[PDB]
Amino acid sequence: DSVAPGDIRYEDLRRGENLRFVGDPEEIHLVGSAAEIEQVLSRAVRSGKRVAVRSGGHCYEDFVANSDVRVVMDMSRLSAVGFDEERGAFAVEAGATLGAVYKTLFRVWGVTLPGGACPDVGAGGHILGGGYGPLSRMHGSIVDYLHAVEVVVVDASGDARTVIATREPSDPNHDLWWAHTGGGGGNFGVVVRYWLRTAPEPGRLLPRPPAEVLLNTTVWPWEGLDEAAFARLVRNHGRWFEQNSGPDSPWCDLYSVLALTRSQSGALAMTTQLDATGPDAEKRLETYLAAVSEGVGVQPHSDTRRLPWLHSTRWPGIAGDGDMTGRAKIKAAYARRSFDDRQIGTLYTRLTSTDPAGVVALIAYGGKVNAVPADRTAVAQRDSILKIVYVTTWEDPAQDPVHVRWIRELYRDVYADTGGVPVPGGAADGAYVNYPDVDLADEEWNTSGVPWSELYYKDAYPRLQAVKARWDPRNVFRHALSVRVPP
């Protein structure tokens, strides 16, 4: 159907899962096929009305709900996951949530994709932004399994058409397939479905997860934590990840997130997942936990459970708490090395100061992600060890400026020696387009002289611009931080 203001569904469908952003579309179309997408597109382009696509609605920025967007194509009716006998690959429609993808692939076929934690995320935005997750160190990015994609595009004359692009070098649309391996949503056209398989039995055509995992939750009380203690914990963790994130590391089967929380929360915490298949799994876990707490002087509460693998993906310790109400602002960076002492000092001061819920999360990364050449996909960061996510959440819709400023100042200060942004090719490797932050393109917050596009895409940017020029010459698909041809 089509949803317009006044329809009972309008208040829900005008929003994604980020409540800071309220869309004003004149029409939201729950499209049912490529053919219906082509008709909504060609009609919007003729009218001069700006469009956007919503799949899972997890965009951290206002790309879909931007007040200029007059027409939304919502992919909820296209949520199938299955094996496509004709193409010999798994077909994930854009509106499928990760929880549905993982349940279907694993229960029916015993396989999985190494995408996000977070069952409510849609495939649409997630895959073509370079999705990664708990199994990425073991199995790479989800885009490392992208075999082909179906996408509705608009030509110079304004007519919409459906094309298939694939990983085969001789594919005439090969360049468009490459741009879907991390190029980001909302840039090239409307993805209808992705086809994924390893680069003819379905059970053999995607990776098999561990049957069981050890999951641990470790908590340090903040009350008895001084700066030196905090700094040793952070340095322990960063040194361990600097040593143990290569593509041939035995530690490819470990994932963890260390949460550096505001002191007012009462505790810092870390969640770890380790493949439990080996009979020494428990010893290996403890050696990782011991490394993180060595010399800290605070004993953590520690609890470890063995869980079947599909059950573990729904545990809020990995999946997050599912609460998408209230208001949040995210920033993020790639880390090639962990923070230096001065940055640790900044973190400690900003986390303990009574100047607000807020966390800096360090998410294990690298491993098999890093076996891929930096230019093979549009995910150009293939030597990092951690993704660092800065977050502040609040409730009062009248108090956005103060929370945005807190997180802006923290991030600027951490990256102050590189113009306030994580400039690639140093201790940092730029930014991740599925954690978009419009401040990276803001002269007031980015003083590095490096454009937002090089921070997200590094050297992939020129190729993406060429794909943009070829496949979206009219620039129908745009938003803050969208791939844009040279002026």
Ligand X SMILES: *Cc1cc2c(nc3c(=O)[nH]c(=O)nc-3n2C[C@H](O)[C@H](O)[C@H](O)COP(=O)(O)OP(=O)(O)OC[C@H]2O[C@@H](n3cnc4c(N)ncnc43)[C@H](O)[C@@H]2O)c(*)c1C
Ligand Y SMILES: CC1=CC(=O)[C@H]2O[C@]1(C)O[C@H]([C@H](C)/C=C(C)/C=C/C(O)=C1\C(=O)CNC1=O)[C@H]2C
Ligand Z SMILES: CC1=C[C@H](O)[C@H]2O[C@]1(C)O[C@H]([C@H](C)/C=C(C)/C=C/C(O)=C1\C(=O)CNC1=O)[C@H]2C
Binding-site residue numbers for Mg(2+) are 120
Q: Could you say which residues in the range 305-364 bind ligand X, by CB under 6 A?
A: 320
Closest to ligand Y by CB, 329 vs 478, is: 329
Structure tokens at 44: 């919007």
Residues constituting the chain:
487
- Which part of the chain contacts ligand X (CB under 6 A), choosing from 46-54, 295-303, 408-416, 437-445? 46-54
Other beta carbons within 10 angstroms of residue 21's beta carbon come to 20
Please name the residue that has the structure tokens 């053999």.
204
Among 21, 60, 194, 461, binds ligand X (CB under 6 A): 60
- For Cl ion, the closer of residues 18 and 313 by Cβ is 18
B/e letters for 441-478, b = 16+ CB within 10 Å, e = fewer, are: beeebbebebebbbbbbbebbebbbebbeebbeeebbb
Name the residue among 150, 171, 159 with its Cα closest to residue 91: 150
Q: Is 379 in the site for ligand X (CB under 6 A)?
A: no
Could you give the CA distance from residue 77 to residue 33 in angstroms, rounded to a whole number? 9
Beta bridge partners of 218: 270, 302
Show binding-site residues for FAD. Answer: 53, 55-59, 117-118, 122, 125-126, 132, 191, 432, 434
Choice between 255 and 457, CB closer to ligand Z: 255
Q: Of 427-446, which residues contact ligand X (CB under 6 A)?
A: 434
Q: Minimum distance between the CB of residue 323 and Mg ion, rounded to whole angstroms? A: 5
Return the bridge partners of 213, or none. 275, 307
Minimum Å distance from CB 444 to ligand Z? 23
Q: Where along the sequence are the contacts to ligand Z (CB under 6 A)?
A: 117-118, 257, 320, 323-324, 326, 328, 330, 361, 363, 389, 391, 393
93 to each of 42, 77, 243, 475, how far by Cα in Å? 22, 9, 38, 24
Q: What is the nearest approach in angstroms of ligand X to the Cβ of residue 281?
A: 23
Cβ-Cβ contacts under 8 Å for 165 (sequence gap 6 or more):
148, 149, 151, 171, 173, 174, 175, 176, 177, 180
- Distance in Å, CB of 22 to its own copies, minimum: 10
In whole angstroms, the minimum distance from the beta carbon of 391 to ligand Z comes to 5
- Residues of the shown chain interacting with ligand Y in the complex, contacts defined by CB under 6 A: 117-118, 257, 320, 323-324, 326, 328, 330, 361, 363, 389, 391, 393
First to last CA, the chain: 39
Q: Which positions make up the binding site?
A: 53, 55-59, 117-118, 120, 122, 125-126, 132, 191, 432, 434
Least separation in angstroms between residue 192's CB and Cl ion is 23
Three-state SS at 422: coil
Applying CB under 6 A, the residues found at the interface with ligand X are 16-17, 52-60, 63-64, 75, 94, 116-118, 120-122, 124-126, 129, 131-133, 185-186, 190-191, 320, 434, 479
